[PDB]
Amino acid sequence: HHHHHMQSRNNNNLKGIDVSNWKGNINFESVKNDGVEVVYIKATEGNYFKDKYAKQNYEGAKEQGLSVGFYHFFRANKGAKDQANFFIDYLNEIGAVNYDCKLALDIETTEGVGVRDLTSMCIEFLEEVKRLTGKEVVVYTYTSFANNNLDSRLGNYPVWIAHYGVNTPGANNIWSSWVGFQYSENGSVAGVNGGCDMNEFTEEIFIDSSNFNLDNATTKNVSTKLNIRAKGTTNSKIIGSIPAGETFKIKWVDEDYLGWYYVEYNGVVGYVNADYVEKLQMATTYNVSTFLNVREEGSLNSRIVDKINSGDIFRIDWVDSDFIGWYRITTKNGKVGFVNAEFVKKL
Numbered sequence: 341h342h343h344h345h346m347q348s349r350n351n352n353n354l355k356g357i358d359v360s361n362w363k364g365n366i367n368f369e370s371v372k373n374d375g376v377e378v379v380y381i382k383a384t385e386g387n388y389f390k391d392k393y394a395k396q397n398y399e400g401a402k403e404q405g406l407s408v409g410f411y412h413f414f415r416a417n418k419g420a421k422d423q424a425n426f427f428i429d430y431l432n433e434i435g436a437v438n439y440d441c442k443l444a445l446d447i448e449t450t451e452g453v454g455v456r457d458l459t460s461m462c463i464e465f466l467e468e469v470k471r472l473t474g475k476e477v478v479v480y481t482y483t484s485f486a487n488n489n490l491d492s493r494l495g496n497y498p499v500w501i502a503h504y505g506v507n508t509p510g511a512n513n514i515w516s517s518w519v520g521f522q523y524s525e526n527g528s529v530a531g532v533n534g535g536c537d538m539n540e541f542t543e544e545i546f547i548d549s550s551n552f553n554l555d556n557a558t559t560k561n562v563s564t565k566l567n568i569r570a571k572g573t574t575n576s577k578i579i580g581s582i583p584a585g586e587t588f589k590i591k592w593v594d595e596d597y598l599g600w601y602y603v604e605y606n607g608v609v610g611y612v613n614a615d616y617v618e619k620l621q622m623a624t625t626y627n628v629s630t631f632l633n634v635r636e637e638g639s640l641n642s643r644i645v646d647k648i649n650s651g652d653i654f655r656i657d658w659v660d661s662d663f664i665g666w667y668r669i670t671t672k673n674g675k676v677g678f679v680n681a682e683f684v685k686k687l
Contacts, residue, residue, distance in 0.1 A: 344511075346516065354542070354543070355375050355376050361382065378406065378441055379406050381393075382394065386413070409440070409443070420465040439547070441546055458489060479498070482501075494515075504523060519545050521541075549649075550651045554589065557590045557620055558585065559584050562582075565584060566617075568610035570610060570611070572611040586605070591609070599614050601617050620657075623656050624684075632680075634647060634669065634677035648679065665681050
């Protein structure tokens with residue numbers, strides 16, 4: 341019968357780990373060369389504990405070009421906003437002003453607090469952190485803990501779920517999807533002594549969400565279809581095709597194959613001859629201090645269907661003649677609509 345679950349692990353996800361003072365000295369270059377891409381570091385616990393290795397780990401991780409995040413171990417017996425401030429004050433105290441991942445609330449104990457109140461406290465903490473940093477947050481906890489000692493109100497925040505021994509986090513009555521999955525506490529990672537905490541993170545773990553990762557190219561001078569080959573060579577095997585006029589995503593240009601684009605179209609990843617590729621027009625906001633409305637059609641009385649956050653990247657699809665002065669676009673979230681030209685900067 342029906343069994344709704346969260347997504348399973350996926351090699352396509354970012355490889356991550358999380359450390360604390362318990363690990364002592366860590367060789368981050370080694371961690372960097374072990375495939376690890378993001379590192380969450382413990383910063384504080386309650387309003388009475390500072391992880392003394394946070395600065396060392398933050399600087400070490402950043403030196404290796406790794407993405408960094410910090411987590412606070414919540415102690416419900418202490419003030420919620422008090423702890424939020426304790427947490428942020430310490431990050432500043434150690435000069436950690438360039439973390440790349442959402443601030444994490446590690447909630448895994450109740451300290452004897454009821455469900456309604458414990459959930460309320462977590463919310464207070466989360467909002468205070470957002471208020472203080474203007475940055476986003478993520479909730480870390482274990483499946484059964486959430487199902488028994490917290491209520492669904494925390495479902496408004498993304499979750500970094502912990503559940504070992506499985507390829508899929510278990511049934512959850514608060515979240516239906518995760519941005520982080522801690523699947524093991526006994527992993528073996530170069531540069532970390534003993535058993536290391538292992539994680540898979542989706543791109544939503546990042547604070548910077550301005551990127552556009554949808555199709556950015558289409559064909560040109562192609563009468564019917566554009567061949568996708570295993571390598572940038574007609575001597576290479578055709579592993580796919582792109583019908584004329586369709587869009588796809590250019591990943592990058594490979595050195596061994598200049599003059600070709602490494603792309604992805606409907607599941608296939610290969611090389612295409614650049615002479616037949618036309619890049620689509622990317623753009624961002626201009627003179628937008630907050631956000632830009634995306635409307636159903638190019639008019640001020642038209643239903644607002646989405647928003648473009650200052651600095652976000654979107655695609656200009658075409659100019660609809662019915663709405664001169666506006667662009668028909670596609671947002672980083674796949675949504676289509678119109679935006680006022682006075683606020684767009686082509687890239």
